[PDB]
Design a protein around this ligand. Sequence first.
Ligand SMILES: CCCCn1c(Cc2cc(OC)c(OC)c(OC)c2Cl)nc2c(N)ncnc21
Length: 209
Amino acid sequence: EVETFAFQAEIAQLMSLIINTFYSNKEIFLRELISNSSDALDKIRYESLTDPSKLDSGKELHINLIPNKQDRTLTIVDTGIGMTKADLINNLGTIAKSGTKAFMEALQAGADISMIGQFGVGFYSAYLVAEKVTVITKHNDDEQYAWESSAGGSFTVRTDTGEPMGRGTKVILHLKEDQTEYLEERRIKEIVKKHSQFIGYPITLFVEK
Ligand SMILES: CCCCn1c(Cc2cc(OC)c(OC)c(OC)c2Cl)nc2c(N)ncnc21
């Protein structure tokens, strides 16, 4: 069964703001996702010091950027800690609620959208460039799941019967028609070099085709 949930009002409201505000500097969505991945890889690495069995789902700690012009997707892959079902449905949105208030407050005071990351809600910057985001994730303690939202105030969760991923997270950005620049190799390299040059894991930019 695919299950459908309502975002908290405040989260829905943030997402509409990100979709609706005029803001040209959309490229910062990629460092927000990569930094989420880097945080997630730090977590698993730390947890495995006191529990080496946590890496039985895979030792390699890395980030892949995968463009696909044919599906119009950019996918951000990591082998970090992953998320559980309770993360996806409840936990993450509960934390996200206060970062959302603070972010929204700071924007009136003239902070700008590029600062979303300081408020723990940088994931939603994905909606600057994506018409739909699909999140595939596998935590050690749990099953593999697919979360997916086109905003509009709802999200879905189902158990994923697709490829098994070992441990980690794929964020599949289904790009808006006029955002296909983020599928171009030189563009991605440029942004990674500009905003994400000091990440402590290998980041592989896959090329087509
Ligand atoms: C915000 C901290 C943790 C959530 N998280 C995120 C960011 C994130 C945050 C969310 O809430 C604020 C969120 O809920 C809609 C989310 O969706 C599945 C993701 Cl994807 N990315 C990763 C990742 N690559 N690996 C592990 N955990 C992640």
